[PDB]
Amino acid sequence: PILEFLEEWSMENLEEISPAAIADATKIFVNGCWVGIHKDPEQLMNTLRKLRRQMDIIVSEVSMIRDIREREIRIYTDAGRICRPLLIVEKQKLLLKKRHIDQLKEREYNNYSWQDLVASGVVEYIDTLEEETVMLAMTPDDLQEKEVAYCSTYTHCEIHPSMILGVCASIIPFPDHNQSPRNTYQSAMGKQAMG
Amino acid sequence: FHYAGVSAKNVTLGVPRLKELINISKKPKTPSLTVFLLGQSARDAERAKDILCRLEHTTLRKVTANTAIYYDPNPQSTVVAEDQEWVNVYYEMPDFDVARISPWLLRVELDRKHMTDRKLTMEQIAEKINAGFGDDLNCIFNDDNAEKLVLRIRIMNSDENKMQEEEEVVDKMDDDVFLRCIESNMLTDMTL
């Protein structure tokens, strides 16, 4: 489906490409296969991201990466890519709003769930390769709000920083107040506890 | 990782150094040599600098800003505008012109910063290149007053004549390819 859409959206195929025209245009790789070149990259990139956030043609797992310096757009539909969900920031305002959490709070008898949040475009899955192209905020309110200017172009926000820890490390209370090797040791001791 | 900046040198210490000494490895990971200066050279920093220059390997590639190989049929023609003056001066009383002049020209520009840092001399470099390749290389060097340090190199005039009646159509590397090989060898192994 992505290849069909790319053909629709003014992507000249490699076979039809004059060799001189490649130099000034971005190369579009899908699953590691150089499909063609696109003369205007940013419009295509925005369209692909819109499609993924509406979940129309591009599935949520599909990751689009644009390397602006190297003039390459890479789209991976491959399996085994590790992804974490992140909130989406437009302008400097989080897309997640009070109405969404009100619907989620009454999750029972409203049939509103994480899938509805993904479909609404509030959250998105991002793999590491796409993480390289993403400006993230650790905490929304602190970093998004205007201050002494550090970054005014945040594109995503972390849901909560404590989710970086795994299952065994999540049982440690006040992990940030411990030495790192001690958290590592507790992760191994917690597997051997009795219960 | 946890040495100090006081050493100001790469030093292998700890278990890897113990393994190097225990196994008596032919090649240490960081071979080092501590040189103690005999007399006034130890007292004066400038004399120590002279000894340093004596002890540190320096090649033409380190002091060469850029190299260009030109084709100039006539030395008097001076295809490069800049070298017109000193080529004309040298050819006012030309040397080795009687044998011939090789048309291919290797032009080497030497960075003044590196040249003065190692305290090298244009005449010194010319002598070293002349000694290394014998008479097969003829070198023209600018005066130090010139803003750009230029060394002009041509194939041997006797070799250009070939000094042989038969002349041997082998034509190994012609002269341009031979000049490129000469440039590479000079840059890598000049040992000025």
Partner: peptide, 8 residues
């Protein structure tokens, strides 16, 4: 975890 000269 301390510094460059100390320990990690």
């Amino acid at each position: 975890i301390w510094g460059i000269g100390c320990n990690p």
